[model samples]
Target: SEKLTFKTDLEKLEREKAAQIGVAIVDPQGEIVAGHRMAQRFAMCSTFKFPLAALVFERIDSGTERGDRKLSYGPDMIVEWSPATERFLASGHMTVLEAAQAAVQLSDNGATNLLLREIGGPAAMTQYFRKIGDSVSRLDRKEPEMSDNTPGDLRDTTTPIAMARTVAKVLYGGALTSTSTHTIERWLIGNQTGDATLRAGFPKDWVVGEKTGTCANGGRNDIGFFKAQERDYAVAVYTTAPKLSAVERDELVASVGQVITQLILST
Candidate 1:
């Protein structure tokens, strides 16, 4: 059966380069094509931004807010992760839609916090997640702050299965109204930033909208939607190996995309 074949293929993947890893890839039909310890949770790093952004859109769909509404850049929101967001810093004003674009496409820490503030902070997001019946995800704090890390602090987190499901929901599971969905998906599809992890396996003929997250040590993760001719799927891959070189870690992630490509091609 294809299920067993996929499991075999996943288990056969090279792992000498990674200390720990988890993966979950769900087909458009909601079938799990491949997974390993998919329920094991890890700090989501930046992938949490995906849902946070969606929560923003949910409010927009409910007529509680507008995507075009402008937000001022708080001086405290500045961070070093965003080159694309530099212009906003000088102007100190950006529309909600632009903030979202920076969050999804640029992974701008400042832009992410701006969105978080407008959406009512981390508590609001976790509450929304529970309302939406998300069982394995949590957003505990803003970025840059979490990135600064003192000692012994819990960061935003999710499981491979949970993150994949969330991506599927926002992109394909009707999590948002048509208008808001289109709004969010457009920003996702325009993601020009996450090039190292999931995008490593970018196909010349396929279309993908993905988000990448990285933390100190060797923590690297990616989750996204991949659409080919007649098939579309959501995939999440998380890896952490404090001992692995950045190059090796990148290859580990790229390998996930390669394997996924092979699986889709074979099907």
Candidate 2:
């Protein structure tokens, strides 16, 4: 939240950290280690899901959608299968808030697509995103199909920088003026870390909240925070490379700490 005054080879540090083309690391002490350009944005990767879920519930409290609103499964919600995916869900009767959780916790396509439909679809979701001053959140899924309808095009996507800002808001607790923050936090804790992505590399004993996504054009992203030992650190890492194995695809910038072999729990 201040000027990046720490002078060092942040770019090189990031490169060394991931051995990749691009990277950005903000140390626990507010030091920018890698990409300054990325640190400036709110981390627009799968990390955006945190605030998106929070916003869904925030609107529920504001009478946007009633709580406990059930969304039932329907045929229209189906999408083609990706073995790596937890099977994108079908349409179902769920609360505006519940839909958000299912969408994030499981990356349920149907839930997200339907919620996208209910909230004016992508256009409406974007409106809410802008309301929160998020200029990057946009419709990543809006397909017209029967068996499955998930927008898998990497062309429509977000970054991890936007995610850092989003999780910061959730951790701040004042970003959303409703009990939804608490409810959303509950879901955040229950997220079944997919043994892949950033969550795979963090300290197991500590708490790590994360979400994941991969699309065509080699778009891969993971972002979240680590809270433990009174030290709180937020991270957002994303890659747009080709032919990365699933192992390489899912690491939480482990190459940095993994390569450094210097385990650290940030402030």
Candidate 3:
């Protein structure tokens, strides 16, 4: 079966790196093109910022929040990997749009926390996903804590399929206004974190919007969409390799991305 062959191909990749991998590549129409361990949960790390940004943009679109509205924060909000928000620590404030940009584009922890608070917290994020009909994804903690990818812990996790579906929904599911949708799309297309992962596999002309996640425990993930001519495809690739170096893990993901690129082009 082609399905079994696809699963075997992923397993071979996993075995070569001695890592656990989960992948789901889907079309805009919600069709699964290829997947392996798609139902298994993996640490989401900063990838949660994508949906969090979507939630914030949804609020902005609905008139409950303003993108230009300035929100004030103190030094207590600073956390690791906060380049975007840390610069504002002295100014003590940034606009709602800035926080979302920092969270999604830079994967800024401080900005992520700020936006998490704006949306009410982890529970609110989980509820928003549910409201959008994503039952399998959940955000159980904030950044720094969420990055703690303890083995067997399911907190702050989502299956590859669920994340892919949520991303497609956010981008094209009418859950967001066209303006808000394009706002997110632009941020993701300019994302700085995924160059060596999925984006490395795409051609120069393919318009892509992606987010990447990295944790201290070797959890690495990239989820986003790419346009191939008139068609759009969403993909989620998650990998955890406690025994492998970051470069090795990234190469593995890039290889997977290359395989996905080939698959999408042929279809």
Top of the candidates by TM-score: 3
lDDT of each: 0.75, 0.52, 0.88
- lDDT (10s digit) by residue, model 3, range 122-183: 99999999988889889999989998889989999999999999998898788899988888
- Please identify model 2 stretches exceeding 4 Å from their true place: 1-48, 81-92, 140-155, 256-267
Question: Which 10 successive residues of model 2 have the least lDDT summed?
Answer: 1-10
Question: Best candidate, lDDT-wise?
Answer: 3
Clashes of each: 0, 28, 0
Prediction 3 TM-score vs. true: 0.96
Global lDDT of model 1? 0.75
Q: What is the lDDT of residue 235 in candidate 3?
A: 86
What are the RMSD figures for all models against the true structure?
A: 2.7, 5.9, 1.3
Clashing pairs in 3: none
Which digits, one per residue and each the tens of the lDDT, describe model 1 over residues 47-142?
777787888888888889898898987566777686546777777777887887778887888888888888788888888778766876888888
Q: Local error of candidate 2 at 102, Å?
A: 1.8
Q: Sum up the clashes in candidate 2.
A: 28
Estimate TM-scores for all models.
0.88, 0.71, 0.96
